[PDB]
Structures are given as structure tokens and as C-alpha cells.
mmCIF file of all heavy atoms in Angstrom:
data_model
loop_
_atom_site.group_PDB
_atom_site.id
_atom_site.type_symbol
_atom_site.label_atom_id
_atom_site.label_comp_id
_atom_site.label_asym_id
_atom_site.label_seq_id
_atom_site.Cartn_x
_atom_site.Cartn_y
_atom_site.Cartn_z
ATOM 1 N N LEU A 1 78.680 -55.914 -58.841
ATOM 2 C CA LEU A 1 79.347 -54.906 -58.192
ATOM 3 C C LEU A 1 79.938 -55.341 -56.840
ATOM 4 O O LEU A 1 79.311 -56.106 -56.104
ATOM 5 C CB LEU A 1 78.584 -53.666 -57.908
ATOM 6 C CG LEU A 1 77.762 -53.193 -59.157
ATOM 7 C CD1 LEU A 1 76.774 -52.116 -58.694
ATOM 8 C CD2 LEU A 1 78.679 -52.596 -60.189
ATOM 9 N N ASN A 2 81.215 -54.896 -56.488
ATOM 10 C CA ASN A 2 81.684 -55.032 -55.198
ATOM 11 C C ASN A 2 81.725 -53.838 -54.416
ATOM 12 O O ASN A 2 81.997 -53.759 -53.198
ATOM 13 C CB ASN A 2 83.083 -55.811 -55.090
ATOM 14 C CG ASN A 2 84.130 -55.096 -55.941
ATOM 15 O OD1 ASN A 2 84.054 -53.946 -56.335
ATOM 16 N ND2 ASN A 2 85.197 -55.805 -56.404
ATOM 17 N N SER A 3 81.517 -52.698 -55.068
ATOM 18 C CA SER A 3 81.537 -51.340 -54.321
ATOM 19 C C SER A 3 80.345 -51.259 -53.351
ATOM 20 O O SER A 3 79.330 -51.870 -53.556
ATOM 21 C CB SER A 3 81.644 -50.209 -55.293
ATOM 22 O OG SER A 3 80.421 -49.967 -55.981
ATOM 23 N N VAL A 4 80.515 -50.368 -52.449
ATOM 24 C CA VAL A 4 79.569 -50.081 -51.371
ATOM 25 C C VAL A 4 79.558 -48.731 -51.063
ATOM 26 O O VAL A 4 80.658 -48.017 -51.131
ATOM 27 C CB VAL A 4 80.001 -50.840 -49.996
ATOM 28 C CG1 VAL A 4 79.028 -50.513 -48.929
ATOM 29 C CG2 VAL A 4 80.220 -52.376 -50.208
ATOM 30 N N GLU A 5 78.429 -48.020 -50.874
ATOM 31 C CA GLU A 5 78.296 -46.682 -50.495
ATOM 32 C C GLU A 5 77.174 -46.412 -49.494
ATOM 33 O O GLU A 5 76.272 -47.298 -49.342
ATOM 34 C CB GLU A 5 78.078 -45.861 -51.791
ATOM 35 C CG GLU A 5 76.863 -46.274 -52.579
ATOM 36 C CD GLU A 5 76.825 -45.474 -53.831
ATOM 37 O OE1 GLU A 5 76.728 -44.224 -53.769
ATOM 38 O OE2 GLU A 5 76.752 -46.076 -54.927
ATOM 39 N N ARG A 6 77.247 -45.364 -48.835
ATOM 40 C CA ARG A 6 76.268 -45.072 -47.693
ATOM 41 C C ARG A 6 75.753 -43.596 -47.706
ATOM 42 O O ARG A 6 76.403 -42.662 -48.032
ATOM 43 C CB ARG A 6 76.831 -45.292 -46.282
ATOM 44 C CG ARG A 6 77.930 -44.419 -45.893
ATOM 45 C CD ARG A 6 78.500 -44.851 -44.664
ATOM 46 N NE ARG A 6 79.294 -43.781 -43.976
ATOM 47 C CZ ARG A 6 80.184 -43.841 -43.125
ATOM 48 N NH1 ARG A 6 80.442 -45.033 -42.627
ATOM 49 N NH2 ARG A 6 80.850 -42.753 -42.585
ATOM 50 N N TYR A 7 74.490 -43.533 -47.378
ATOM 51 C CA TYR A 7 73.749 -42.295 -47.374
ATOM 52 C C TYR A 7 73.701 -41.598 -45.958
ATOM 53 O O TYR A 7 73.201 -42.356 -45.045
ATOM 54 C CB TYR A 7 72.269 -42.451 -47.854
ATOM 55 C CG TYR A 7 71.534 -41.103 -48.150
ATOM 56 C CD1 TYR A 7 71.970 -40.232 -49.212
ATOM 57 C CD2 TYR A 7 70.358 -40.881 -47.451
ATOM 58 C CE1 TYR A 7 71.265 -39.045 -49.423
ATOM 59 C CE2 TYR A 7 69.702 -39.640 -47.803
ATOM 60 C CZ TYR A 7 70.045 -38.795 -48.635
ATOM 61 O OH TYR A 7 69.253 -37.724 -48.837
ATOM 62 N N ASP A 8 73.969 -40.254 -45.885
ATOM 63 C CA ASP A 8 73.860 -39.605 -44.506
ATOM 64 C C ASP A 8 72.660 -38.617 -44.843
ATOM 65 O O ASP A 8 72.726 -37.807 -45.686
ATOM 66 C CB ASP A 8 75.119 -38.822 -44.227
ATOM 67 C CG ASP A 8 75.009 -37.993 -43.055
ATOM 68 O OD1 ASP A 8 74.552 -38.372 -41.916
ATOM 69 O OD2 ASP A 8 75.111 -36.630 -43.268
ATOM 70 N N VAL A 9 71.624 -38.866 -43.965
ATOM 71 C CA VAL A 9 70.387 -38.049 -44.230
ATOM 72 C C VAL A 9 70.643 -36.515 -44.076
ATOM 73 O O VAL A 9 70.318 -35.669 -44.816
ATOM 74 C CB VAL A 9 69.307 -38.572 -43.356
ATOM 75 C CG1 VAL A 9 68.050 -37.724 -43.350
ATOM 76 C CG2 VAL A 9 68.930 -40.029 -43.677
ATOM 77 N N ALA A 10 71.393 -36.174 -42.926
ATOM 78 C CA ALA A 10 71.552 -34.659 -42.670
ATOM 79 C C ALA A 10 72.308 -33.991 -43.838
ATOM 80 O O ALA A 10 72.013 -32.765 -44.050
ATOM 81 C CB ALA A 10 72.311 -34.499 -41.360
ATOM 82 N N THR A 11 73.187 -34.651 -44.491
ATOM 83 C CA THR A 11 73.872 -33.874 -45.563
ATOM 84 C C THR A 11 73.425 -34.235 -46.873
ATOM 85 O O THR A 11 73.935 -33.711 -47.910
ATOM 86 C CB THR A 11 75.446 -34.169 -45.470
ATOM 87 O OG1 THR A 11 75.707 -35.590 -45.608
ATOM 88 C CG2 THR A 11 75.961 -33.684 -44.052
ATOM 89 N N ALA A 12 72.486 -35.248 -46.987
ATOM 90 C CA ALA A 12 72.040 -35.761 -48.253
ATOM 91 C C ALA A 12 73.029 -36.116 -49.175
ATOM 92 O O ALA A 12 72.935 -35.635 -50.373
ATOM 93 C CB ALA A 12 70.914 -34.632 -48.906
ATOM 94 N N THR A 13 74.009 -36.879 -48.722
ATOM 95 C CA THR A 13 75.205 -37.201 -49.418
ATOM 96 C C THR A 13 75.411 -38.741 -49.417
ATOM 97 O O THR A 13 75.342 -39.418 -48.317
ATOM 98 C CB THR A 13 76.509 -36.580 -48.921
ATOM 99 O OG1 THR A 13 76.255 -35.044 -49.092
ATOM 100 C CG2 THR A 13 77.632 -36.855 -49.723
ATOM 101 N N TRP A 14 75.735 -39.297 -50.674
ATOM 102 C CA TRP A 14 76.176 -40.631 -50.657
ATOM 103 C C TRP A 14 77.745 -40.704 -50.811
ATOM 104 O O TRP A 14 78.253 -40.016 -51.544
ATOM 105 C CB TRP A 14 75.608 -41.493 -51.876
ATOM 106 C CG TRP A 14 74.228 -41.782 -51.869
ATOM 107 C CD1 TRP A 14 73.288 -40.851 -52.341
ATOM 108 C CD2 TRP A 14 73.475 -42.825 -51.424
ATOM 109 N NE1 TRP A 14 72.076 -41.430 -52.263
ATOM 110 C CE2 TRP A 14 72.144 -42.670 -51.636
ATOM 111 C CE3 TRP A 14 73.877 -43.998 -50.694
ATOM 112 C CZ2 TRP A 14 71.176 -43.568 -51.327
ATOM 113 C CZ3 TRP A 14 72.933 -44.926 -50.390
ATOM 114 C CH2 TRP A 14 71.477 -44.736 -50.695
ATOM 115 N N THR A 15 78.394 -41.605 -49.931
ATOM 116 C CA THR A 15 79.813 -41.760 -49.894
ATOM 117 C C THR A 15 80.154 -43.207 -49.976
ATOM 118 O O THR A 15 79.593 -44.006 -49.403
ATOM 119 C CB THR A 15 80.426 -41.118 -48.639
ATOM 120 O OG1 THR A 15 79.982 -39.828 -48.466
ATOM 121 C CG2 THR A 15 81.893 -41.290 -48.609
ATOM 122 N N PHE A 16 81.296 -43.462 -50.876
ATOM 123 C CA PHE A 16 81.823 -44.891 -50.929
ATOM 124 C C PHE A 16 82.532 -45.227 -49.651
ATOM 125 O O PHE A 16 83.159 -44.350 -49.104
ATOM 126 C CB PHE A 16 82.740 -45.000 -52.077
ATOM 127 C CG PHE A 16 82.013 -45.059 -53.473
ATOM 128 C CD1 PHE A 16 81.897 -44.016 -54.219
ATOM 129 C CD2 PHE A 16 81.337 -46.240 -53.830
ATOM 130 C CE1 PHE A 16 81.160 -44.051 -55.386
ATOM 131 C CE2 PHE A 16 80.559 -46.311 -54.972
ATOM 132 C CZ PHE A 16 80.530 -45.207 -55.720
ATOM 133 N N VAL A 17 82.620 -46.466 -49.354
ATOM 134 C CA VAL A 17 83.404 -47.032 -48.413
ATOM 135 C C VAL A 17 84.192 -48.116 -48.970
ATOM 136 O O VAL A 17 84.212 -48.254 -50.318
ATOM 137 C CB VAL A 17 82.613 -47.506 -47.177
ATOM 138 C CG1 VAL A 17 81.884 -46.421 -46.588
ATOM 139 C CG2 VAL A 17 81.654 -48.655 -47.515
ATOM 140 N N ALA A 18 84.943 -48.977 -48.190
ATOM 141 C CA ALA A 18 85.692 -50.012 -48.809
ATOM 142 C C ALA A 18 84.896 -51.050 -49.601
ATOM 143 O O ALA A 18 83.802 -51.418 -49.059
ATOM 144 C CB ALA A 18 86.589 -50.782 -47.707
ATOM 145 N N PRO A 19 85.430 -51.491 -50.715
ATOM 146 C CA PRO A 19 84.450 -52.543 -51.364
ATOM 147 C C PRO A 19 84.749 -53.877 -50.867
ATOM 148 O O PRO A 19 85.769 -54.233 -50.309
ATOM 149 C CB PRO A 19 85.084 -52.426 -52.893
ATOM 150 C CG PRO A 19 86.527 -52.279 -52.571
ATOM 151 C CD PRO A 19 86.594 -51.354 -51.309
ATOM 152 N N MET A 20 83.709 -54.785 -51.015
ATOM 153 C CA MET A 20 83.884 -56.113 -50.737
ATOM 154 C C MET A 20 84.928 -56.795 -51.597
ATOM 155 O O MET A 20 85.285 -56.357 -52.664
ATOM 156 C CB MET A 20 82.503 -56.849 -51.005
ATOM 157 C CG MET A 20 81.354 -56.239 -50.244
ATOM 158 S SD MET A 20 79.772 -56.765 -51.149
ATOM 159 C CE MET A 20 78.594 -56.718 -49.876
ATOM 160 N N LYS A 21 85.539 -57.967 -51.170
ATOM 161 C CA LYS A 21 86.431 -58.640 -52.087
ATOM 162 C C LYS A 21 85.802 -59.123 -53.271
ATOM 163 O O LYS A 21 86.436 -59.163 -54.362
ATOM 164 C CB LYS A 21 87.329 -59.624 -51.326
ATOM 165 C CG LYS A 21 88.567 -58.978 -50.536
ATOM 166 C CD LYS A 21 89.623 -58.597 -51.735
ATOM 167 C CE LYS A 21 90.627 -57.638 -51.331
ATOM 168 N NZ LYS A 21 90.473 -56.289 -51.937
ATOM 169 N N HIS A 22 84.628 -59.652 -53.276
ATOM 170 C CA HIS A 22 84.025 -60.190 -54.548
ATOM 171 C C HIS A 22 82.680 -59.604 -54.853
ATOM 172 O O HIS A 22 81.731 -59.534 -53.875
ATOM 173 C CB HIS A 22 83.939 -61.657 -54.495
ATOM 174 C CG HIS A 22 85.189 -62.450 -54.329
ATOM 175 N ND1 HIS A 22 86.195 -62.428 -55.279
ATOM 176 C CD2 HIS A 22 85.831 -63.122 -53.276
ATOM 177 C CE1 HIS A 22 87.258 -63.038 -54.936
ATOM 178 N NE2 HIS A 22 87.045 -63.543 -53.663
ATOM 179 N N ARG A 23 82.495 -59.321 -56.020
ATOM 180 C CA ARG A 23 81.342 -58.681 -56.533
ATOM 181 C C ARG A 23 80.100 -59.686 -56.302
ATOM 182 O O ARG A 23 80.376 -60.884 -56.202
ATOM 183 C CB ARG A 23 81.537 -58.583 -58.075
ATOM 184 C CG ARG A 23 82.830 -57.943 -58.420
ATOM 185 C CD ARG A 23 83.199 -58.000 -59.886
ATOM 186 N NE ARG A 23 84.281 -57.055 -60.151
ATOM 187 C CZ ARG A 23 84.109 -55.838 -60.528
ATOM 188 N NH1 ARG A 23 82.871 -55.442 -60.790
ATOM 189 N NH2 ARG A 23 85.167 -54.999 -60.764
ATOM 190 N N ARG A 24 78.947 -59.126 -56.124
ATOM 191 C CA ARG A 24 77.840 -59.910 -55.735
ATOM 192 C C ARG A 24 76.605 -59.123 -55.911
ATOM 193 O O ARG A 24 76.521 -57.938 -55.521
ATOM 194 C CB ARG A 24 77.999 -60.484 -54.332
ATOM 195 C CG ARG A 24 77.484 -59.581 -53.306
ATOM 196 C CD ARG A 24 77.658 -60.152 -51.893
ATOM 197 N NE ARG A 24 78.796 -61.039 -51.828
ATOM 198 C CZ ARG A 24 79.089 -61.764 -50.829
ATOM 199 N NH1 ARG A 24 78.114 -62.007 -49.900
ATOM 200 N NH2 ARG A 24 80.165 -62.614 -50.822
ATOM 201 N N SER A 25 75.507 -59.670 -56.588
ATOM 202 C CA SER A 25 74.012 -59.113 -56.591
ATOM 203 C C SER A 25 73.237 -60.265 -55.973
ATOM 204 O O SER A 25 73.443 -61.388 -55.825
ATOM 205 C CB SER A 25 73.740 -58.751 -58.038
ATOM 206 O OG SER A 25 73.692 -60.055 -58.794
ATOM 207 N N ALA A 26 71.932 -59.846 -55.712
ATOM 208 C CA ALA A 26 70.913 -60.728 -55.081
ATOM 209 C C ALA A 26 71.517 -61.371 -53.825
ATOM 210 O O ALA A 26 71.320 -62.429 -53.540
ATOM 211 C CB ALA A 26 70.500 -61.884 -56.053
ATOM 212 N N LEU A 27 72.200 -60.445 -53.065
ATOM 213 C CA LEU A 27 72.777 -60.909 -51.742
ATOM 214 C C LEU A 27 71.703 -60.627 -50.705
ATOM 215 O O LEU A 27 70.878 -59.767 -50.762
ATOM 216 C CB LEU A 27 74.078 -60.215 -51.379
ATOM 217 C CG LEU A 27 73.955 -58.596 -51.554
ATOM 218 C CD1 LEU A 27 74.987 -57.877 -50.549
ATOM 219 C CD2 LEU A 27 74.189 -58.097 -52.916
ATOM 220 N N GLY A 28 71.838 -61.430 -49.624
ATOM 221 C CA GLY A 28 71.073 -61.079 -48.526
ATOM 222 C C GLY A 28 72.065 -60.328 -47.620
ATOM 223 O O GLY A 28 73.185 -60.208 -47.779
ATOM 224 N N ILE A 29 71.328 -59.396 -46.808
ATOM 225 C CA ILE A 29 72.159 -58.480 -45.925
ATOM 226 C C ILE A 29 71.496 -58.270 -44.674
ATOM 227 O O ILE A 29 70.344 -58.144 -44.536
ATOM 228 C CB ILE A 29 72.330 -57.099 -46.758
ATOM 229 C CG1 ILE A 29 73.422 -56.274 -46.090
ATOM 230 C CG2 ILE A 29 70.978 -56.339 -46.941
ATOM 231 C CD1 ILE A 29 74.081 -55.275 -47.104
ATOM 232 N N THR A 30 72.429 -58.119 -43.629
ATOM 233 C CA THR A 30 71.813 -57.711 -42.352
ATOM 234 C C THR A 30 72.977 -57.136 -41.479
ATOM 235 O O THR A 30 74.146 -57.132 -41.776
ATOM 236 C CB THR A 30 71.299 -58.902 -41.538
ATOM 237 O OG1 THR A 30 70.336 -58.512 -40.574
ATOM 238 C CG2 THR A 30 72.357 -59.736 -40.904
ATOM 239 N N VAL A 31 72.508 -56.459 -40.463
ATOM 240 C CA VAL A 31 73.296 -55.885 -39.430
ATOM 241 C C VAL A 31 73.263 -56.687 -38.047
ATOM 242 O O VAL A 31 72.150 -56.999 -37.707
ATOM 243 C CB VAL A 31 73.028 -54.450 -39.162
ATOM 244 C CG1 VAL A 31 73.931 -53.930 -38.032
ATOM 245 C CG2 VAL A 31 73.286 -53.669 -40.443
ATOM 246 N N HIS A 32 74.426 -57.097 -37.613
ATOM 247 C CA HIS A 32 74.609 -57.910 -36.376
ATOM 248 C C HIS A 32 75.702 -57.227 -35.452
ATOM 249 O O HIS A 32 76.771 -56.916 -35.923
ATOM 250 C CB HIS A 32 75.100 -59.205 -36.695
ATOM 251 C CG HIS A 32 75.066 -60.176 -35.396
ATOM 252 N ND1 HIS A 32 76.163 -60.284 -34.622
ATOM 253 C CD2 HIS A 32 74.179 -61.136 -35.060
ATOM 254 C CE1 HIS A 32 75.930 -61.268 -33.584
ATOM 255 N NE2 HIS A 32 74.698 -61.817 -33.924
ATOM 256 N N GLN A 33 75.301 -56.876 -34.275
ATOM 257 C CA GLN A 33 76.241 -56.265 -33.266
ATOM 258 C C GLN A 33 76.998 -55.078 -33.949
ATOM 259 O O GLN A 33 78.277 -55.102 -33.938
ATOM 260 C CB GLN A 33 77.255 -57.245 -32.746
ATOM 261 C CG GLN A 33 76.867 -58.309 -31.636
ATOM 262 C CD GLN A 33 77.869 -59.493 -31.408
ATOM 263 O OE1 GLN A 33 78.918 -59.554 -31.988
ATOM 264 N NE2 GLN A 33 77.366 -60.375 -30.522
ATOM 265 N N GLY A 34 76.268 -54.192 -34.635
ATOM 266 C CA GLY A 34 76.967 -53.111 -35.137
ATOM 267 C C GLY A 34 77.945 -53.345 -36.333
ATOM 268 O O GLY A 34 78.826 -52.617 -36.570
ATOM 269 N N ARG A 35 77.733 -54.489 -36.959
ATOM 270 C CA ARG A 35 78.420 -54.947 -38.158
ATOM 271 C C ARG A 35 77.710 -55.465 -39.319
ATOM 272 O O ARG A 35 76.544 -55.944 -39.049
ATOM 273 C CB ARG A 35 79.472 -55.951 -37.736
ATOM 274 C CG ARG A 35 80.447 -55.650 -36.561
ATOM 275 C CD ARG A 35 81.303 -56.774 -36.125
ATOM 276 N NE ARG A 35 82.176 -56.424 -35.089
ATOM 277 C CZ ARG A 35 83.091 -57.220 -34.496
ATOM 278 N NH1 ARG A 35 83.244 -58.464 -35.039
ATOM 279 N NH2 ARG A 35 83.895 -56.831 -33.595
ATOM 280 N N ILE A 36 78.048 -55.234 -40.554
ATOM 281 C CA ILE A 36 77.231 -55.696 -41.678
ATOM 282 C C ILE A 36 77.748 -57.111 -42.081
ATOM 283 O O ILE A 36 79.069 -57.261 -42.332
ATOM 284 C CB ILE A 36 77.510 -54.764 -42.825
ATOM 285 C CG1 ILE A 36 76.754 -53.340 -42.578
ATOM 286 C CG2 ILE A 36 76.810 -55.315 -44.151
ATOM 287 C CD1 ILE A 36 77.057 -52.347 -43.576
ATOM 288 N N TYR A 37 76.914 -57.887 -42.364
ATOM 289 C CA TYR A 37 77.139 -59.137 -43.059
ATOM 290 C C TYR A 37 76.434 -59.278 -44.350
ATOM 291 O O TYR A 37 75.215 -59.099 -44.348
ATOM 292 C CB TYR A 37 76.799 -60.284 -42.095
ATOM 293 C CG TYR A 37 77.534 -60.561 -40.860
ATOM 294 C CD1 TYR A 37 77.285 -59.772 -39.733
ATOM 295 C CD2 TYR A 37 78.829 -61.145 -40.927
ATOM 296 C CE1 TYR A 37 78.035 -59.933 -38.427
ATOM 297 C CE2 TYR A 37 79.602 -61.339 -39.694
ATOM 298 C CZ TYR A 37 79.167 -60.566 -38.642
ATOM 299 O OH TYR A 37 80.090 -60.774 -37.468
ATOM 300 N N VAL A 38 77.108 -59.731 -45.371
ATOM 301 C CA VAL A 38 76.522 -59.936 -46.697
ATOM 302 C C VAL A 38 76.717 -61.525 -47.008
ATOM 303 O O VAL A 38 77.686 -61.986 -46.753
ATOM 304 C CB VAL A 38 77.217 -59.052 -47.744
ATOM 305 C CG1 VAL A 38 76.854 -57.641 -47.465
ATOM 306 C CG2 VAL A 38 78.616 -59.296 -47.942
ATOM 307 N N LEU A 39 75.576 -62.146 -47.496
ATOM 308 C CA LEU A 39 75.416 -63.595 -47.639
ATOM 309 C C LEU A 39 75.080 -63.869 -49.032
ATOM 310 O O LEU A 39 74.014 -63.620 -49.606
ATOM 311 C CB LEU A 39 74.247 -64.084 -46.699
ATOM 312 C CG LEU A 39 74.477 -63.981 -45.092
ATOM 313 C CD1 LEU A 39 74.438 -62.685 -44.533
ATOM 314 C CD2 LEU A 39 73.420 -64.909 -44.524
ATOM 315 N N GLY A 40 76.031 -64.683 -49.625
ATOM 316 C CA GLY A 40 75.808 -65.242 -50.962
ATOM 317 C C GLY A 40 75.667 -64.232 -52.048
ATOM 318 O O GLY A 40 76.211 -63.125 -51.979
ATOM 319 N N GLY A 41 74.712 -64.485 -52.968
ATOM 320 C CA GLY A 41 74.738 -63.686 -54.126
ATOM 321 C C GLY A 41 75.275 -64.503 -55.413
ATOM 322 O O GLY A 41 75.618 -65.635 -55.206
ATOM 323 N N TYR A 42 75.343 -63.701 -56.395
ATOM 324 C CA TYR A 42 75.785 -64.191 -57.653
ATOM 325 C C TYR A 42 76.772 -63.168 -58.235
ATOM 326 O O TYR A 42 76.593 -61.981 -58.303
ATOM 327 C CB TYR A 42 74.615 -64.457 -58.652
ATOM 328 C CG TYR A 42 74.878 -64.912 -60.055
ATOM 329 C CD1 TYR A 42 75.444 -66.315 -60.270
ATOM 330 C CD2 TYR A 42 74.758 -64.152 -61.144
ATOM 331 C CE1 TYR A 42 75.779 -66.620 -61.492
ATOM 332 C CE2 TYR A 42 75.105 -64.597 -62.521
ATOM 333 C CZ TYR A 42 75.557 -65.855 -62.583
ATOM 334 O OH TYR A 42 75.875 -66.295 -63.865
ATOM 335 N N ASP A 43 77.938 -63.710 -58.705
ATOM 336 C CA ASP A 43 79.034 -62.806 -59.125
ATOM 337 C C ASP A 43 79.221 -62.757 -60.614
ATOM 338 O O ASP A 43 80.280 -62.362 -61.080
ATOM 339 C CB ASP A 43 80.343 -63.254 -58.393
ATOM 340 C CG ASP A 43 80.962 -64.549 -58.938
ATOM 341 O OD1 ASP A 43 80.254 -65.264 -59.643
ATOM 342 O OD2 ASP A 43 81.996 -64.788 -58.585
ATOM 343 N N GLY A 44 78.195 -63.237 -61.307
ATOM 344 C CA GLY A 44 78.322 -63.443 -62.754
ATOM 345 C C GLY A 44 78.821 -64.794 -63.214
ATOM 346 O O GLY A 44 78.741 -65.089 -64.403
ATOM 347 N N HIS A 45 79.318 -65.576 -62.358
ATOM 348 C CA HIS A 45 79.892 -66.930 -62.756
ATOM 349 C C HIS A 45 79.378 -68.026 -61.920
ATOM 350 O O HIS A 45 79.295 -69.066 -62.212
ATOM 351 C CB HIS A 45 81.477 -66.868 -62.805
ATOM 352 C CG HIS A 45 82.085 -65.907 -63.790
ATOM 353 N ND1 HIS A 45 82.078 -66.158 -65.113
ATOM 354 C CD2 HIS A 45 82.665 -64.674 -63.495
ATOM 355 C CE1 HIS A 45 82.734 -65.155 -65.690
ATOM 356 N NE2 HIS A 45 82.956 -64.165 -64.775
ATOM 357 N N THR A 46 79.357 -67.575 -60.595
ATOM 358 C CA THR A 46 79.163 -68.579 -59.456
ATOM 359 C C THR A 46 78.056 -68.133 -58.495
ATOM 360 O O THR A 46 77.931 -67.031 -58.221
ATOM 361 C CB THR A 46 80.438 -68.762 -58.691
ATOM 362 O OG1 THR A 46 81.450 -69.293 -59.520
ATOM 363 C CG2 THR A 46 80.475 -69.536 -57.428
ATOM 364 N N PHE A 47 77.397 -69.134 -57.845
ATOM 365 C CA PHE A 47 76.559 -68.866 -56.728
ATOM 366 C C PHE A 47 77.287 -68.857 -55.422
ATOM 367 O O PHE A 47 77.789 -70.036 -55.147
ATOM 368 C CB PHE A 47 75.240 -69.761 -56.649
ATOM 369 C CG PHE A 47 74.342 -69.430 -57.876
ATOM 370 C CD1 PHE A 47 74.477 -69.998 -59.091
ATOM 371 C CD2 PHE A 47 73.215 -68.668 -57.681
ATOM 372 C CE1 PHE A 47 73.695 -69.682 -60.245
ATOM 373 C CE2 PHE A 47 72.437 -68.184 -58.751
ATOM 374 C CZ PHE A 47 72.681 -68.835 -59.955
#
């Protein structure tokens, strides 16, 4: 998947945001300076 969604606790709602350009699972993820970085993963064809 390349889609991304986020949960707001107060409204108990999940909402989609912009998708990544390339699908990826088993990615590493972290937040740096108020920004999200996603690292590597597997897209069904390539590491």
C-alpha cells in the first residue's frame, strides 16, 4: 500500500492524507522535527 491515514482521538475518526509515491510494507517509520520519514520496505518487487 501507498495510502496513509491518521486517527484523531477526540473524534474517534480515521482520515486519509496524501499517499506516498511508492507502495511499501515492513517500512521503518519515525518523526523528525515535526515531519514523518518512511525508510525502505518492500513494494512487492524490490527492497
Side-chain angles (χ1 to χ4, degrees):
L1 312 169
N2 55 21
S3 72
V4 179
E5 54 187 304
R6 65 181 199 203
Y7 189 68
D8 174 58
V9 175
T11 61
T13 300
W14 293 89
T15 303
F16 285 102
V17 302
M20 300 159 158
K21 270 289 162 251
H22 300 291
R23 317 167 164 269
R24 84 181 31 191
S25 65
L27 53 152
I29 194 152
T30 202
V31 173
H32 189 271
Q33 284 165 3
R35 302 179 181 180
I36 294 173
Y37 290 90
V38 295
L39 290 68
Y42 179 68
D43 73 342
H45 300 280
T46 295
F47 291 86

